[PDB]
């Protein structure tokens, strides 16, 4: 078995190699890289997103989102406040001042200590969740926006054409801006790249796993827990490095630089940080493998989750003994 202890791989591939997508992934997957549900690729050197990122202060940010911690300093949820909208040039500005910026530090790991020391006692605003893209139309190589879309795949894979799309997500962090625990939405991979800026810390817990991380939150999050079966699905709790390792919960950790990818794998619990002010983008994909993972994807259907369109289709086609309660939780 390839990857038996489940590391985070890094993968280099050639400008050859960066042509096909998918035939990429499944070398990755024929190496291991899915047991850590995390993997970091480096684009070849020849290769770039888009020209220049000098011209994206005018991109609004019609919902920037406050991020409150309530809980303890290892142990948290947030909630997100509702901020008035601003242009990126705007939040680069804000991210950049005194109240947000980056303190200090030595390197990444004297960050992370602070991180999981102070960030309960503030907080940042993210511009998370923008539809759109930065790649250039002509980056004709992993870009974000051109991807085959999961409901070709279903239907690819299973003969059912169903209605949905599929496009990707801008992210714009600064300092202490958090992503809670979570798997995607029915189990889904993702892929990051980080556009600009500075760095996101991820943390991620293996597939083979995934029910230790859960059986861990249902005891220190016990009211959220009682309140709905898949609770992680409202994407709000926080659990520390130091409070996993004291409870047994396998899991790696990495940082991710501008001009990298990450992909994340069907059912890999991830959450993370930024550094500073940044620009990523993200979506969701699928693959033959995924399939089965998305028949047996949890779901929230308390009502709090609240999701695109485009997951009413998977539901019913991979769970249809599930729709009819998920669909009442959307409804
Ligand atoms: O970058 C973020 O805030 C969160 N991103 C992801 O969870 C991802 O790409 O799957
Ligand atoms: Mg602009
Ligand atoms: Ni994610
Ligand atoms: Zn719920």
């Not at 202060?57 to 909208?85: D, M, N």
């Not at 990444?108 to 999981?116: A, I, M, P, T, V």
């Not at 605003?125 to 795949?153: P, R």
Request: hydrophobic share 35%; glycine share 8%.
């Amino acid at each position: 078995a390839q990857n038996p202890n489940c590391n985070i791989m890094i993968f280099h591939p050639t400008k050859e190699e960066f042509n096909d997508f998918d035939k990429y992934i499944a070398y990755m997957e024929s190496q291991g890289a899915h047991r850590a549900g995390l993997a970091k690729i480096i684009p070849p050197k020849e290769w770039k997103a888009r020209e220049t990122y000098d011209n994206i202060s005018e991109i609004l940010i019609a919902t920037p989102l406050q991020q409150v911690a309530s809980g303890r300093a290892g142990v948290f949820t947030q909630y997100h406040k509702k901020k008035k909208a601003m242009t990126v040039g705007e939040y680069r500005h804000l991210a950049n001042s005194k109240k947000y910026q980056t303190p200090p530090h030595q390197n990444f790991e004297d960050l992370e200590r602070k991180y999981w020391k102070n960030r309960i006692y503030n907080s940042p605003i993210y511009g998370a969740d923008i539809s759109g893209s930065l790649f250039d139309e002509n980056t004709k190589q992993w870009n974000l926006g051109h991807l085959g879309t999961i409901q070709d795949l279903l239907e690819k894979e299973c003969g059912v054409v169903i209605e949905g799309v599929n496009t990707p997500y801008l992210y714009f962090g600064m300092w202490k801006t958090t992503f809670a625990w979570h798997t995607e939405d029915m189990d889904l991979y993702s892929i990051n790249y980080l556009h600009l800026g500075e760095p996101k810390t991820w943390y991620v817990v293996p597939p083979e796993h995934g029910q230790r991380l859960e059986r861990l939150a249902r005891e220190l999050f016990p009211g959220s827990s009682r309140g709905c079966g898949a609770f992680l699905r409202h994407k709000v709790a926080l659990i520390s490095p130091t409070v996993l390792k004291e409870n047994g919960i396998p899991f790696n950790r990495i940082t991710q630089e501008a001009g990298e990818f990450m992909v994340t794998f069907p059912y890999g619990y991830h959450a993370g940080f930024n550094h500073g002010f940044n620009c990523a983008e993200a979506i969701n994909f699928a693959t033959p493998r995924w399939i089965d993972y998305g028949k047996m994807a949890s779901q929230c259907s308390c009502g709090e989750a609240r999701v695109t369109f485009s997951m009413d289709a998977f539901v019913r086609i991979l769970q249809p003994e599930r729709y009819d309660l998920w669909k009442r939780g959307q409804d």
